Design an enzyme around this catalytic site. Structure first.
Site, mmCIF file in Angstrom:
data_model
loop_
_atom_site.group_PDB
_atom_site.id
_atom_site.type_symbol
_atom_site.label_atom_id
_atom_site.label_comp_id
_atom_site.label_asym_id
_atom_site.label_seq_id
_atom_site.Cartn_x
_atom_site.Cartn_y
_atom_site.Cartn_z
ATOM 1 N N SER A 60 0.809 -1.210 0.000
ATOM 2 C CA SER A 60 0.000 0.000 0.000
ATOM 3 C C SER A 60 0.850 1.270 0.000
ATOM 4 O O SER A 60 0.267 2.347 0.058
ATOM 5 C CB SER A 60 -0.925 0.056 1.172
ATOM 6 O OG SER A 60 -2.102 -0.662 0.920
ATOM 7 N N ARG A 74 2.536 6.650 5.154
ATOM 8 C CA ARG A 74 1.809 5.717 4.324
ATOM 9 C C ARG A 74 2.468 4.365 4.548
ATOM 10 O O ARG A 74 3.689 4.273 4.446
ATOM 11 C CB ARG A 74 1.893 6.165 2.865
ATOM 12 C CG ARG A 74 1.187 5.238 1.884
ATOM 13 C CD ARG A 74 -0.258 5.602 1.553
ATOM 14 N NE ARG A 74 -1.232 5.491 2.631
ATOM 15 C CZ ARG A 74 -1.864 4.384 2.995
ATOM 16 N NH1 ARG A 74 -1.624 3.265 2.351
ATOM 17 N NH2 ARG A 74 -2.736 4.405 3.999
ATOM 18 N N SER A 75 1.677 3.330 4.873
ATOM 19 C CA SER A 75 2.260 2.053 5.280
ATOM 20 C C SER A 75 1.711 0.926 4.427
ATOM 21 O O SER A 75 0.790 1.105 3.640
ATOM 22 C CB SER A 75 2.037 1.759 6.718
ATOM 23 O OG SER A 75 0.729 1.267 6.894
ATOM 24 N N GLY A 76 2.336 -0.236 4.548
ATOM 25 C CA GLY A 76 2.004 -1.329 3.665
ATOM 26 C C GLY A 76 2.176 -2.662 4.376
ATOM 27 O O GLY A 76 2.959 -2.764 5.318
#
Lengths: 266, 266
Positions: free
Chosen positions: B46, B210-212
């Site tokens: 993401s 923003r992380s994934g």
């Protein structure tokens, strides 16, 4: 009947994730209540942290411990996932601070601290018995309590039992109003659950919540939601024994939450 | 040297999780920069969503698409984990709204929408090339882009490449100041990352992030942190090919973040 759709969503998820799923919903205005597998046992994981910080506040009211009293963090006390406490090796923390930490970030070292100041896993269980929770039980500290093994009774609740407990903590008289309000804030100021029920919360509604994850795919949340017109509704959702991805488990929780919320917005 | 400790923390984690770990850190004040495996490839998961909503805003400035224009949500468009969009089947959403959704909750249906309005995975890749990112590439939509398979080039970046890209989006001139400020807000108003770098952020510091997460244990974040005295620092952390628990992977990220932050607070 009202919750027929919720039920179908739950049954679907239970199939797709090859899981055990438990749900319980308490409407405090009237006395309506609903469960799916509401009597089945699931691991608490971090949903327990609420109980131990409600103990701290209660035990303080009774004069048995001071929340402005500080414990000293040693390197060797650290367990997996302690953001707040790992910043503070060789500093002292107020139990009050430690509850803020474990309730808002789910810092595990902070939870172990709180546990040590309220008589351990046996203290928490005794406490639950005295407010009339007969099912919920804490037996271990962090991190082994997350083991979530099949047929293991340790560190379990039922969706209904913890939903009732949370009901009594916030809206019953076990705690002073100020301390109910503190516990509410800890739960309202939770920073690590935006991906769950908050992400489907109706506009303008409030939410106080505590969530959990652990072993063999256990995933849960316990929450209170309310608003100007909607009196507190208590929600308890527990998954277990699944190989689903965290993302799949999070998806399950927001679908079920949205159905539950829908009941009360149309 | 300055980042020696960071390096040791990373090496430890790489051992404990039997993982591939990549880190890159850009100091915008001077031009200092640091990486561990900064050239290795990792899945975006993401962390890509930033790039597609930076495209939307850019392409709007050029008059090629309207962000107040609305798409219509059909039931069959839904993919796993879409909190915002699943509340809106048979309603229309402004792309602007859809970026807010995918940047703040990481709604996946919303991401697919945004993708369709900026020329698909090939549009995003072309765009990256034009700002001078030569490594990062999007190839698939949700959810297959999260597959995170070994030696698979699709849907990958390098810690350094995405850190540079994010640098240019927010602080370079590709975008108008207003649109830089919008993108910043999307990232600042992220609701689903309290358990990562935010949980170890120094008091009073800001953060846009923003992380994934995805397959074969991929876990990442890309963030900008700044404060009254500390000029923007860009952080890029990617894990992959691990069997660690999400909790273990989250623990790895907050340890590495805290070391990184420590560099800049003593």
């Amino acid at each position: 009947s009202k919750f027929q759709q919720v039920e179908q969503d739950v049954k679907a998820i239970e199939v797709s994730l090859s899981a055990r799923i438990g749900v319980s919903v308490l409407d405090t205005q009237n006395g309506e209540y609903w469960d799916y597998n509401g009597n089945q046992r699931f691991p608490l994981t971090s949903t327990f942290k609420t109980i131990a910080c409600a103990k701290l506040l209660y035990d303080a009211e009774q004069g048995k411990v001071n929340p402005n009293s500080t414990v000293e963090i040693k390197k060797a006390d650290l367990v997996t996932y302690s953001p707040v406490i790992e910043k503070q090796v060789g500093q002292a923390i107020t139990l009050d601070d430690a509850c803020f930490a474990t309730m808002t970030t789910s810092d595990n070292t902070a939870a172990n601290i709180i546990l040590s100041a309220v008589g351990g896993p046996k203290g928490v269980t005794d406490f639950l018995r005295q407010i009339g929770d007969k099912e919920t039980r804490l037996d271990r500290i962090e991190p082994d309590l997350n083991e979530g093994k099949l047929g293991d009774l340790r560190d379990t609740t039922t969706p209904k039992a913890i939903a009732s407990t949370l009901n009594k903590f916030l809206f019953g008289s076990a705690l002073s109003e100020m301390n109910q309000k503190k516990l509410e804030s800890w739960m309202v100021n939770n920073q690590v659950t935006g991906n769950l029920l908050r992400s489907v919360l109706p506009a303008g509604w409030n939410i106080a919540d505590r969530s959990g994850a652990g072993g063999f795919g256990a995933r849960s949340i316990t929450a209170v939601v309310w608003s100007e017109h909607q009196a507190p509704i208590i929600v308890s959702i527990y998954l277990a024994q699944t190989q689903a991805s965290m993302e799949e488990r999070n998806d399950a929780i927001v679908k079920i939450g949205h159905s539950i919320f829908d009941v009360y917005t149309s």
